[PDB]
A paper describes a structure:
Here, we report a 4.4-Å cryoelectron microscopy (cryo-EM) structure of [name] ([name]), an alphavirus that causes fatal encephalitis in humans. The icosahedral shell of alphaviruses consists of an outer layer of trans-membrane envelope E1 and E2 proteins and an inner capsid layer separated by a host-derived membrane. Alphaviruses utilize the E2 protein for attachment to incompletely characterized receptors (Schwartz and Albert, 2010, Zhang et al., 2018). Endosome acidification triggers conformational changes in the E1 and E2 proteins that generate the fusogenic conformation of the E1 protein (Gibbons et al., 2004, Haag et al., 2002).
The binding footprints of Fab fragments of five neutralizing mAbs ([name]-3, [name]-5, [name]-42, [name]-58, and [name]-69) were mapped using cryo-EM structures. [name]-5, [name]-42, and [name]-58 Fabs bound to domain A of E2 utilizing primarily polar interactions. [name]-5 and [name]-42 Fabs interacted with Lys71 and Lys74, two of the three HS binding residues (Gardner et al., 2011), whereas [name]-58 interacted only with Lys74 of the three HS binding residues. These three Fabs also make a few interactions with residues in domain B and the β-connector. [name]-5 is the most radial in orientation of the five Fab fragments and forms an angle of 14.5° with the spike 3-fold axis, whereas B domain-specific [name]-69 is the most tangential with an orientation angle of 52.0° with the spike 3-fold axis. The [name]-5 Fab had the lowest average occupancy of 45%, whereas the [name]-58 Fab had the highest average occupancy of 97%. A Fab bound to domain A in a radial orientation will clash with Fabs bound to the other two symmetry-related positions on the same trimeric spike lowering average Fab occupancy. This is consistent with the low occupancy of the approximately radially binding [name]-5 Fab and with the higher occupancy of the more tangentially binding [name]-58 Fab. Here, it seems likely that mAbs whose Fabs bind to E2 domain A cause intraspike cross-linking due to the presence of three symmetry-related copies of domain A near the 3-fold axis of the trimeric spikes. In this analysis, only the mAbs and not the Fab fragments achieve significant neutralization unlike the common observation that both bivalent mAbs and monovalent Fabs achieve neutralization (Edeling et al., 2014, Fibriansah et al., 2015).
Residue numbers in the entry:
A (entry chain A): 50 to 245
B (entry chain D): 501 to 711
C (entry chain C): 1 to 218
D (entry chain B): 501 to 825
């Protein structure tokens, strides 16, 4: 889930402050005029329409993104394993980890054993998978870079470290009301909020 | 660049409630001025009473409380005591520096009067060996703290040669002072009766030596 | 608990420098910085600045930016005031103070400076014993006259300081260009002259120390 | 301790120092991490986390925490404070409603935020129990020795303070806190920047047409949305977060055991939970044929078990398994 970690808006008191499209993820910024911002002393900007307010807000990974986070995957077939016990013959023991590919031995104990390949290639994982903590979902996640806001993957970071991401959150700033300092951020709660 | 103003002097009686105020020349005093109240007892003895308007320093009796009354900081002594007679200074913070008020001298009824203890000493002999003689008149434990000291050599009011210190406050809150009459080894040996007369709250005490 | 004990009072001729120490006791030096206040003879109390005993940065009041320099022997819980190129109108008393509780909570004893031109004269210490005749009461008053010294200060004790009760030491006063001080002590009539009573006087400026036992006149 | 504009501050929009931003009802353990704009914790200087510094005036007030109240639909329970930030164990609530008591005044602050507390598990409780299994919840710490993240905290912008703009008996008179930087001019033409001690105003007279400003950037702030930018620069002040979300194993849920009843290749199960429990199964044939249903109302259910087996998941109670030959 996102966090609309709003940078603190500019308030020019008499005249405009043009905004620029900073490279923050989903950097929504919209200049606003026609304010009279009550801040602790009543208003403070002495004009009345030239009072300008520039709201800016970008999307950022939550602190929970590091730890409580869904996780997509493109899943191929790989190679299956097993801790095969054989309490063999009179040997009476070997508990060894093996493979399935039909030329791999595993000389753990005394016996050499070749397994598979199995005929039952049903990977219960689908091609596309989402993963969450322990509950694994064979979900057709839309993709990195695309996820519709509100839908799953509104925030899409490659990894946790990745400062870049894709944040289609439909974050739309609105003008603050009646000459008061604040930042209307109108936004879909995450497609990670739903999906839980 | 701000001027803190305080009452000049206030007089009360033991058991009364008295209020001292602290006014700022720039505007009302507010909690961001962190009014402090400091007390000065005799002997250059300073202690802090209240800080941050109403925080009482630890070990300051509860009869002392601070507050903001109107547009000024105030110190109230509830049940003033004789021991509270001192100079109270207020301090106000102004974003980067402190400004102290002029202080309020507070007088509290109490301490029954006490007569002075007068002693006159003769010039010692090691000093008469210098061709000098100094008669020391010591006066201690008197209250109220105001006296008149008059010297009389041989029946005649000396009028030159004497020096009398200013009453200094002792610890018990009574006062002391000493007066010196310097003669010459010779002036000494000439005249015969020396006397230090101390006048205090109407009674007189004369201490005479005889050479 | 908290004691800020200051150096003793100095005399210095115009132009000199002085370092006034403030030794702190009872608190952790580091979490409470020091206020330096000037109480000038007439004028009342004035903030001279504050020193961050943690970082070491001083703030000076504008009146004090220049000849005044705050520093600290951190290590020994001492803060110090140094006034360089002493001006004659710097005679006054300087207090160190602890800033805490949104104000100042403890003040020191004060170190008084008397900026004044003059040489160095050692004091003459004279015993003051009672009149040659009688002197019979329940108690008895002896004295000690410390005459003609310069500059300040002198220290005076009775019996090395073991006799402090019943003592009145009288502030030094300037007379004919020299300071004179005196002290009295009162003890029971059985104590003296049975037991020895001694006046102890030190004048640091002249390295003079005098011990004068009060002897009976006959 | 920053001060911002609380939205429904008892009456209406005040400017409370405890103005609530970044409500996070995103964990599971009945807990919310909150940021006040007020920085409680140690005092102004050095002592005792359990004291209380908000802004009164331009000034702090670093005093005791005596009567904090976070609350929601019900009164919450504090967990710990550090910095601008408090952790508190709350129940669910449509809103969040915070406030201490200075002593002369209630002086609270309140805000909207959708809160819930699902515990981790197939049981949908409303509250953590005393017993049950432990399993990997998401939750915030008690502690402060914490660096796992840090939020930008650069300077404050200016702030209004018309207590400054007094009158010089005919002219409007500005002053300064402590030599702080007061940014000043009026609608008329007079001094145009203001980087000064206490100035006067030659030209204008009315207090209501002048720039009462406080560039007082000796201490940085949180970068609240309810902050005006310090226009000069992105000053330094990268500053940690205490209350990191951590992988605590909450003391957690457990649903009452089922009543297993045999039939021919069929599990009748008279069932009777405490709370809504997500039951589900997996017929282990390559035909999965699973089932899901939250059960809060007690219900006798059925499961056509096959020859090879079925498994059965009574809430976060462990999964069962069954031979139905």
């Amino acid at each position: 889930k996102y966090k609309t970690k709003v940078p603190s808006p500019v308030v020019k008191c008499c005249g405009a402050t043009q905004c620029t499209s900073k490279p923050h993820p989903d950097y929504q910024c919209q200049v606003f005029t026609g304010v009279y911002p009550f801040m602790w002393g009543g208003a403070y900007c002495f004009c009345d329409t030239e009072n300008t307010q520039m709201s800016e807000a970008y999307v950022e990974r939550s602190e929970e993104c590091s730890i409580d986070h869904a996780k997509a995957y493109k899943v191929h077939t790989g190679t299956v394993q097993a801790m095969v016990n054989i309490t063999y013959g009179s040997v009476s023991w070997r508990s060894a980890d093996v493979y399935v590919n039909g030329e791999t031995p595993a000389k753990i104990g005394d016996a050499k054993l070749i397994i598979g390949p199995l005929s039952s290639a049903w990977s219960p994982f689908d091609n596309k998978v989402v993963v969450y903590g322990h509950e694994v979902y064979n979900y057709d996640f839309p993709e990195y870079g695309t996820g519709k806001a509100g839908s799953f993957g509104d925030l899409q970071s490659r990894t946790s470290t990745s400062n870049d991401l894709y944040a289609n959150t439909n974050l739309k700033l609105q003008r603050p009301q009646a000459g008061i300092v604040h930042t209307p951020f109108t936004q879909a709660p995450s497609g990670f909020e739903r999906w839980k | 660049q701000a001027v803190v103003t305080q009452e000049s002097a206030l007089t009360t009686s033991p058991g009364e409630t008295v209020t001292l105020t602290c006014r700022s020349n720039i505007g009302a005093v507010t909690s961001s001025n962190c009014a402090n109240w400091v007390q000065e007892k005799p002997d250059h003895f300073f202690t802090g009473l209240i800080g941050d308007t109403n925080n009482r320093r630890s070990g300051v009796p509860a009869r002392f409380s601070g507050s903001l009354i109107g547009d000024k900081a105030a110190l109230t002594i509830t049940g003033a005591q004789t021991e509270d007679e001192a100079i109270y200074f207020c301090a106000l913070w102004y974003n980067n520096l402190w400004v102290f008020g002029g202080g309020t001298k507070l007088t509290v009824l109490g301490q029954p009067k006490s007569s002075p203890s007068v002693t006159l000493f003769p010039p010692s002999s090691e000093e008469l060996e210098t061709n000098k003689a100094t008669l020391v008149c010591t006066i201690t434990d008197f209250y109220p703290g105001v006296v008149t000291v008059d010297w009389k050599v041989d029946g005649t009011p000396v009028t030159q040669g004497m020096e009398t210190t200013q009453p200094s406050k002792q610890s018990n809150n009574k006062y002391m002072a000493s007066s010196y009459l310097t003669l010459t080894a010779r002036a000494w040996e000439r005249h015969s009766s020396y006397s230090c007369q101390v006048t205090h709250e109407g009674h007189t005490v004369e201490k005479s030596l005889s050479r | 608990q908290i004691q800020l004990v200051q150096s003793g009072r100095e005399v210095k001729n115009p132009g000199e420098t002085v370092k006034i120490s403030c030794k702190a006791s009872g608190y952790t030096f580091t979490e409470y910085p020091m206020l330096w206040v000037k109480q000038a003879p007439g004028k009342g109390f004035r903030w001279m600045g504050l020193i961050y005993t943690n970082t070491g940065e001083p703030t000076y009041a504008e009146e004090f930016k220049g000849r005044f320099v705050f520093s600290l022997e951190i290590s020994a819980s001492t803060a110090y005031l140094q006034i360089n190129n002493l001006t004659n109108e710097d005679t006054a008393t300087y207090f160190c103070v602890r800033d805490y509780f949104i104000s100042l909570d403890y003040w020191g004893q004060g170190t008084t400076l008397t900026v004044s031109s003059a040489k160095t004269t050692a004091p003459s210490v004279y015993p003051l014993a009672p009149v040659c005749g009688g002197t019979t009461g329940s108690s008895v008053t002896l004295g000690c006259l410390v005459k003609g010294y310069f500059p300040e200060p002198v220290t005076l004790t009775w019996n090395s300081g073991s006799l402090s009760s019943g003592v009145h030491t009288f502030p030094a006063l300037l007379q004919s260009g020299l300071y004179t001080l005196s002290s009295s002590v009162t003890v029971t009539s059985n104590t003296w002259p049975s037991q020895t009573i001694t006046c102890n006087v030190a004048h640091p400026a002249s390295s003079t120390k005098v011990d004068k036992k009060i002897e009976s006149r006959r | 301790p920053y001060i911002a504009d609380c939205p429904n501050c008892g009456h209406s929009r005040c400017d409370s120092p405890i103005a609530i931003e970044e409500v996070r009802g995103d964990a599971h353990a009945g807990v919310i991490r909150i940021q006040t704009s007020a920085m409680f914790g140690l005092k102004t200087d050095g002592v005792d986390l359990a004291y209380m510094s908000f802004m009164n005036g331009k000034t702090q007030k670093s005093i005791k925490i005596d009567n904090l109240h976070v609350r929601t639909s019900a009164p919450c329970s504090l967990v710990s404070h550090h910095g601008y930030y408090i952790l508190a164990q709350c129940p669910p609530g449509d809103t969040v409603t915070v406030g201490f008591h200075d002593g002369p005044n209630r002086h609270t602050c309140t805000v909207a935020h959708k809160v819930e507390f699902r515990p981790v598990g197939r049981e949908k409780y409303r509250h953590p129990p005393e017993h049950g299994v432990e399993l990997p919840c998401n939750r915030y710490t008690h502690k402060r020795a914490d660096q796992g993240h840090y939020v930008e905290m650069h300077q404050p912008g200016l702030v209004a303070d018309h207590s400054l703009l007094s009158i010089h008996s005919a002219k409007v008179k500005i002053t300064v806190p402590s030599g702080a930087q007061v940014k000043y001019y009026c609608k008329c033409p007079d001094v145009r920047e203001g980087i000064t001690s206490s100035d006067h105003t030659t030209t204008c007279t009315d207090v209501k047409q002048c720039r009462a400003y406080l560039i007082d950037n000796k201490k940085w702030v949180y970068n609240s949305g309810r902050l005006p930018r310090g226009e000069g620069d992105t000053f330094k002040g990268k500053l940690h977060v205490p209350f990191v979300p951590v992988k605590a194993k909450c003391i957690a849920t457990l649903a009452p055991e089922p009543l297993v009843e045999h039939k021919h290749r069929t599990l009748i199960l008279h069932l009777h939970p405490d709370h809504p429990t997500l039951l589900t199964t997996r017929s282990l044939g390559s035909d999965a044929n699973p089932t899901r249903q939250w059960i809060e109302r007690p219900t006798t259910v059925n499961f056509t078990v096959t020859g090879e087996g079925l498994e059965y998941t009574w809430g976060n109670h462990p999964p069962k398994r069954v031979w139905a030959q």
